[PDB]
């Protein structure tokens, strides 16, 4: 639970060896028919990041490269990206309030590589600043391809910011240069500032369930979900308010919004559970309440506040927006120069990732720069500087717009 570094994975890397080189192993995960893998999601790690007076950051045995009495202080975290070029737009949803970024380049595909800056194309509005140059061809074709290919990849670094950390030519099946890669991600990647004593909040992302058949009714049960901190550090056992929570159906007033808070026990931390919520990673929040409400799949997209919080939540929405004048990065000369990105039509489905929550976007009135919308469910107020409008243009989603709360 320390760093939310991102990664940009196109087709055919070999992904379990590189991610498990930087996350150790996979978590025990479950409850199939999950959510479609182009939606919002988060990563994790079963490792940590450290050193041993050593460029090498091994796995937690203390001798095997050599000694160095590892600092059992923190745990590394991560954000997932499977190895196909589809993984653009939900990652650019994730490329706003994460921590850093990996940058994946193969040599298996086209060597005048099309996809990487087709992938990395929000280096201005949101944050995209900490990367690495990472060659993934040591296997098939030797030093001629890599020889011209380092000139290829240094033909990327000029105004498109592709120079954050220089070339690492590897195949992660050998796990090579992970001493040098770990030295880069210790030293050459910093840790950005946070806030500590702020009142903590969370929007719920990835719910779970812990009452499989075969136990007693006297067990402690409740609602476990997933999340990651935007502010504060969340302790155990207080008035943890969720402000509308359930969709308040047939709500006739304003004070007919229900006061519902909870408590908390589990905050999963790979071996333990530090009861103050360690940010910079996936936090394993489990609520006290025993309903049909939260511990089902019913709850994704609600706030974590306290008694007497500030945001009042209704549907009155007006947004100021603009668009993108092509489909971002995609330009194929074999009959693909008309992937047209059309203006906001009335009553059209969208994806409005306000902050970091996927609710589908409905619209009601269209001007050239502002729009009055109404949304599919009651949705909290998070930020005005980004309202990440996405929209159907192909089989999966792509992001099209940037918004502003008015």
């Amino acid at each position: 639970a320390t760093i939310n570094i991102g990664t940009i994975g196109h087709v055919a890397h070999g992904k379990s060896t590189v991610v498990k080189a930087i996350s150790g192993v996979h978590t025990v995960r479950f409850k199939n028919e999950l959510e479609r893998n182009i939606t919002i999601k988060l990563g994790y790690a079963n490792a940590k990041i450290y050193k041993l007076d050593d460029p090498s950051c091994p796995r937690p045995e203390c001798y095997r490269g050599t000694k160095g009495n590892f600092k059992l202080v923190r745990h590394v975290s991560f954000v997932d990206c499977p190895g196909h070029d589809i993984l653009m737009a939900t990652m650019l949803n994730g490329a706003a309030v994460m921590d850093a970024a990996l940058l994946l380049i193969a040599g298996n595909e086209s060597c005048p590589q099309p996809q990487t800056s087709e992938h990395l194309a929000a280096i201005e509005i949101m944050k995209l600043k900490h990367i690495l140059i990472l060659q993934n061809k040591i296997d098939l074709v030797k030093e001629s391809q890599a020889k011209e290919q380092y000139e290829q990849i240094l033909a990327f670094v000029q105004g498109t910011v592709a120079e954050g950390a220089p070339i690492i030519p590897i195949s992660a099946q050998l796990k090579y240069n992970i001493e040098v890669v770990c030295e880069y991600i210790v030293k050459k990647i910093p840790v950005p500032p946070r806030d500590f004593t702020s009142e903590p909040r969370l929007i719920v992302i990835r719910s779970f369930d812990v009452n499989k058949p075969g136990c007693e009714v006297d067990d402690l049960k409740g609602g476990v979900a997933g999340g990651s901190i935007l502010k504060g550090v969340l302790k155990v056992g207080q008035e943890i308010e969720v402000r509308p929570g359930i969709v308040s159906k047939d709500s006739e007033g304003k004070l007919m919004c229900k006061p519902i808070f909870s408590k908390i026990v589990s905050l999963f931390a790979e071996h333990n559970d530090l009861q103050y919520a360690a940010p910079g990673g996936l936090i394993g929040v489990g609520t006290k309440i025993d309903p049909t409400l939260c511990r089902a799949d019913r709850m994704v997209g609600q706030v974590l506040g306290a008694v007497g919080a500030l945001p009042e939540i209704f549907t009155e929405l007006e947004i100021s927006y603009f668009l993108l004048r092509r489909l971002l990065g995609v330009r194929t000369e074999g009959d693909k120069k008309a992937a047209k990105v059309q203006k906001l039509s009335k009553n059209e489905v969208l994806m409005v990732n306000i902050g970091s929550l996927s609710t589908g976007g409905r619209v009601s009135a269209v001007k050239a720069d502002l729009g009055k919308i109404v949304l599919t469910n009651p949705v909290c107020t998070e930020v005005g500087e980004k309202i990440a409008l996405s929209r159907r243009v192909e089989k999966h989603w792509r992001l099209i717009g940037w918004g502003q709360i008015r």
Binding site: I138, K142, A146, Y150, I167, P169, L174, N177
Partner: peptide
């Protein structure tokens, strides 16, 4: 980028 010629000698002379 000295890391690349470090690979070019040692890594490819010893490993893949």
């Amino acid at each position: 980028d000295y890391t690349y010629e470090e690979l070019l000698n040692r890594v490819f002379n010893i490993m893949r």
